[PDB]
Amino acid sequence: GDTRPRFLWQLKFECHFFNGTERVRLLERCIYNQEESVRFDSDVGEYRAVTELGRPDAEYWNSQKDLLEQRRAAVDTYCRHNYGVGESFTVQRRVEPKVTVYPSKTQPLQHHNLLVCSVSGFYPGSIEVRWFRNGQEEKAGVVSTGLIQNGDWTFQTLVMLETVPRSGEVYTCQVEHPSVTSPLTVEWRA
Amino acid sequence: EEHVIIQAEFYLNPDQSGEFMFDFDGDEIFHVDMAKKETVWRLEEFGRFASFEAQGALANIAVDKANLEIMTKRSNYTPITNVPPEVTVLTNSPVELREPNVLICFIDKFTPPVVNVTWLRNGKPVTTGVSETVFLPREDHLFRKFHYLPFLPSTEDVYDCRVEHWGLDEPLLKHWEFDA
């Protein structure tokens, strides 16, 4: 069988943006197998070895003025540049969520009704899902499966709510998302 | 912060695997096909708003290999430790009978970036309409990957995402069936 040892090498250039393009940080990092060995942090201004394995590179790369100069200006020429280029179809990409409410197929403890608020197919991932019982927000009993990233520029999540249903009550699921000017609501009539 | 754009690349010996991609908040923007020497946009429309010179990935990858060689020798040929994947199977949306959907096999937290994934419909291999992504980066430097299978729900069909990785002593099968 194939049992040869593997040897990996990753290179990553991370551009972190705060308040749009107001503050930008470039983080160039090298990883041997699962160990980051050396990096260039625009906040630091030069390469810094992360482990002994990277010491030679930090020293050698810092001795190259042209390289350091390029790395030092990349926050503008690289980060802010590519942000301007991709802004229209990434930062501004918006797809409204599909929202539906139905009871869980579970329903363990008898005289109780576990509600499921399904929110899917949306983008970006930033979203707020809240439950309300007759106009007032519910704090306890609420449970989420968390935000699921589908890998296709789409997200989904389920937010359950344990209840003691009483004829006449109106349990509302509220969803606030960048794709809509006003919150989306789906009611469950108990 | 609010946004992160990552240019991630890698080279793996002795498989000779090379990859070059761009990531936006965890979602791939595009990667470069090293054989056809062209840019492959994650979503078709992206390619109409921007462009990327694929030859640039090929120049970088050559430097990345040379560096891998140097580092391999510098660590006294310390090989990578296999870290097995966490596998989860889910539908991209709530499932309803005879209602088109897509099975998603999420392979996460693993390294090195090499895996064999196959779908099984009632114990048999499925090839129709399946697609997959390239290895995506993680802050811990391990990888993520998605495999998809478009299908039509029914109480008769049962599926399995079969994953093989050097970190797994045996192939891992994640079962899925209509239980809603």
């Binding site: 290179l11 250039f13 160039e28 030679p56 590179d57 050698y60 790369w61 190259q64 390289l67 990349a74 020429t77 690289y78 540049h81 590519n82 301007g84 280029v85 991709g86 | 240019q7 690349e9 761009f22 923007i29 595009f30 708003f49 921007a50 462009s51 990327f52 010179e53 640039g56 990935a57 120049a59 970088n60 430097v63 990345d64 040379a66 560096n67 060689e69 140097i70 580092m71």
Partner: peptide, 15 residues
């Protein structure tokens, strides 16, 4: 609009 890449730096010895 073109997305611009950062270019890899060679380690010493690899040069």
């Amino acid at each position: 609009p073109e997305v611009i890449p950062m270019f890899s730096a060679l380690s010493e010895g690899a040069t």
